């Protein structure tokens, strides 16, 4: 809507207070005009019809329990936009400042969040397995990254290309978490997963096997479930990414870590310049090696570490 840009205040899912960019026109709307073509957050009102209604508030104060998921979806979408713009010089998910839209309170007791090809959608969780999904910055960044992938490499969501698609979302979801410096770690979804259990997460990049996911190509899932194991086999790539950044010895192969910033530069270049819709793990290795070569030279430590990391997880 057309209005005056202002700043409101509210509390997120985890009870933390934060300022959010809003727009005033009779009501105060969750519309941030400071980032690209704007960030819009909608209320799906427990229904499944999308996008729902643009979030309207009477006083620009968002401290009601019902407001929490909206506050975080709006705020974290902004942080993710900032990461891509400041770190990778990318304007929104399409590279042309496309408006970012999110809907919260989708369905009832919905333990899922997703990118539907046009916008992000967040369930409230059932209160047991998940609390409102937008409360996790790595969750929000994971979802917005699916949009980035769709506009660039276009990795098909099935088998190996799909596992790469998933890993890319986990990798950048984690890098955004570190960017925001919000209790960063190499775990996925820890802030909104199982509120009754502390110390766990949905997936682990540092040790995928902790939750039963493969950490070596020899242990890859070859079945048909989960679109060919896209959320399972992503563990193989997540482990490789973790090793490239942090280093370590995995299955007898030693990797010298080169840091998170270089990891991000290498994978972003691979995603935007070399990967294609049908790329498999072997092609990802080639793309990553070429990207590191472009950026640091064929005889650099960076290229060496990328090769070692993929050797460690069995991807040739």
Catalytic residue list: 143, 231
Q: Which does 138 bind (CB under 5 to 8 A by kind): Ca ion, Zn ion, none?
A: Ca ion
**How would you classify residue 221: left for phi > 0, otherwise alpha for psi between -120 and 50, otherwise beta?**
beta
Does 197 show up as a binding residue in the annotation? yes
Q: Does 16 bind Ca ion (CB under 5 A)?
A: no
Q: Which does 185 bind (CB under 5 to 8 A by kind): Ca ion, Zn ion, none?
A: Ca ion
Query: Which residues lie below 8 Å from residue 203, measured CB to CB, with a gap of 6+?
Result: 170, 187, 188, 189, 211, 213, 231, 234, 235, 238
Does 32 show up as a binding residue in the annotation? no
Q: Does 197 bind Ca ion (CB under 5 A)?
A: yes
CA 314 – CA 53 distance, rounded (Å): 48
What track of x and - describes contact with Zn ion for positions 152 through 191 (by CB under 5 A)? -----------------x----------------------
CA 9 – CA 17 distance, rounded (Å): 7
Query: Which residues lie below 8 Å from residue 243, measured CB to CB, with a gap of 6+?
Result: 250, 255, 257, 305, 308, 309, 312, 313
Q: How far is the CB of 286 from Ca ion (least distance, A)?
A: 29
- The interface with Ca ion within residues 110-139 (CB under 5 A) comprises 138
The DSSP 8-state label assigned to residue 314 in this structure reads T
Q: Does 59 bind Ca ion (CB under 5 A)?
A: yes
Breaks (C-N over 2.5 A) in the chain follow: none
Instruction: Pick one of 16, 57, 82, 226: the residue that binds Ca ion (CB under 5 A).
Output: 57
Does 119 show up as a binding residue in the annotation? no
Short-list 58, 60, 146, 136, CA closest to 104: 136
Q: Which does 82 bind (CB under 5 to 8 A by kind): Zn ion, Ca ion, none?
A: none
Does 185 show up as a binding residue in the annotation? yes
Short-list 170, 176, 206, CA closest to 188: 170
Instruction: Pick one of 33, 194, 227, 278: the residue that binds Ca ion (CB under 5 A).
Output: 194
Q: Does 233 bind Zn ion (CB under 5 A)?
A: no
Q: Which residues are annotated as a binding site?
A: 57, 59, 61, 138, 142, 146, 166, 177, 183, 185, 187, 190, 193-194, 197, 200
Which residues lie near Zn ion (CB under 5 A)?
169
């Amino acid at each position: 809507i057309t209005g005056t840009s202002t700043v409101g205040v509210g509390r997120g899912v985890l009870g933390d207070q934060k300022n959010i960019n809003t727009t005033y026109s009779t009501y105060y709307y969750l519309q941030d005009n400071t980032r690209g073509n704007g960030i819009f957050t909608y209320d799906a009102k427990y229904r499944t019809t999308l996008p729902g209604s643009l979030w309207a508030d009477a006083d620009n104060q968002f401290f009601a329990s019902y407001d929490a998921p909206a506050v975080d979806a709006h705020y974290y979408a902004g942080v993710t936009y900032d990461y891509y713009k400041n770190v990778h010089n990318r304007l929104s998910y399409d590279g042309n400042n496309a408006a970012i839209r999110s809907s919260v309170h989708y369905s009832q007791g919905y333990n899922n969040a997703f990118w539907n090809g046009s916008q992000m959608v967040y369930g409230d969780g059932d209160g047991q397995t998940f609390i409102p999904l937008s409360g996790g910055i790595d969750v929000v960044a994971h979802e917005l990254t699916h949009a980035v992938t769709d506009y660039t490499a276009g990795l098909i969501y099935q088998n190996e290309s799909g596992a790469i698609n998933e890993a890319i979302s986990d990798i950048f979801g984690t890098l955004v978490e570190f960017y925001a410096n919000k209790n960063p770690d190499w775990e996925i979804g820890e802030d909104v997963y199982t509120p009754g259990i502390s110390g766990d997460s949905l997936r682990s990049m540092s040790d995928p096997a902790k939750y039963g996911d493969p950490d070596h190509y020899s242990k890859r899932y070859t079945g048909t479930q989960d679109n060919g194991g896209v959320h399972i086999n992503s563990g193989i790539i997540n482990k490789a990414a973790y090793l490239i950044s942090q280093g370590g010895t995995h299955y007898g192969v030693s990797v010298v870590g080169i840091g998170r910033d270089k990891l991000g530069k290498i994978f972003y270049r691979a995603l935007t310049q070399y990967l294609t819709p049908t790329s498999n793990f072997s092609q990802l290795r080639a793309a990553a090696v070429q990207s590191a070569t472009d950026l640091y030279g064929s005889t650099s430590q960076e290229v060496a570490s990328v090769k070692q990391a993929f050797d460690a997880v069995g991807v040739k």
